[PDB]
């Protein structure tokens, strides 16, 4: 409630290379032994540019389906972005699948460089899936401290 | 040189709220082929070698494979310590073995931990119920 720096990007576009596992049932293992179910994964790799359509960093994170007591089926992501000028950006956190157009958002913590110290939050929305490992995101990141 | 924290031999009492998942219930989810991993919520006491509470942690972990197989769990969660200051941690480790110690990497966000990176270490050690599990941590975080 008291900050001395703000980091505000906005607009970013996220171009996302998407390797996605549906899961199900395991078939082999001491897990088939088990009453439980693999989780429809994603495991990506973005590349980030900001609005002018220079590129300022990467992403790479993994996202699993999972539901809450009441039956609303969520999202799990854990990831991080790591920017050229400057440093690395952890985000992390559960959000509503659906509807699957609108923004979604997580915490997101600076890590090293010149976010360091700084905490906030990570938001992207999904605009388009062309082909199936790839999607287009529209992103946003908020760090004060 | 930098800032160091070690914390060592944590005793830590979870409390877990266990789901099974699988295909969804209903609604738009039920169009798409997608599963609902099975899930463990958690809210725990972290205490040190003395017993005195130093902290808490709260945390979802959801199960997942890999391409080979390899049943995996994610976790995103974050510790609250008295002092000082929040940590988040959050990662992707192997499920098996269950008592195998697990690493994922840890943030602090606040406090004295401020700006340190690490590691954050847990380990199953036994299971008095379903819902209670007591678990040795550890974490490290630099400058």
Redesign the interface.
């Known amino acids: 409630m008291s900050t001395v720096t703000t980091i505000n990007l906005e607009d970013i576009k996220e171009i996302c290379h998407t390797t996605i596992?549906?899961?199900?049932k395991?078939?082999?293992?001491?897990?088939a032994e088990l009453?439980?179910?693999?989780?429809?994964?994603v495991e990506f790799e973005d590349e980030l540019y900001d609005a002018d359509g220079t590129q300022i960093g990467t992403a790479k994170g993994?996202s699993?389906?999972?539901?809450?007591?009441d039956?609303t089926?969520m999202q799990?992501?854990?990831a991080f972005d790591d920017y050229t000028d400057g440093g690395r950006v952890?985000w992390?956190?559960?959000y509503t699948?659906?509807?699957t157009d609108e923004p979604k958002s997580?915490?997101a913590?600076g890590?090293?460089g010149r976010y360091?110290?700084l905490?906030g939050t990570r938001t992207f929305q999904l605009l388009e899936r062309p082909d199936p490992g790839t999607s287009l995101i529209r992103s946003s990141l908020v760090l004060n401290?």
Not at 26 to 31: L, V
């Open positions: 596992r549906l899961g199900g395991p078939e082999s293992g001491e897990a009453p439980i179910f693999l989780g429809s994964s993994t699993v389906i999972f539901a809450e007591a039956g089926v799990i992501v854990s952890t992390s956190g559960a699948m659906f509807p997580v915490p913590q890590v090293s360091r110290g905490s401290g």
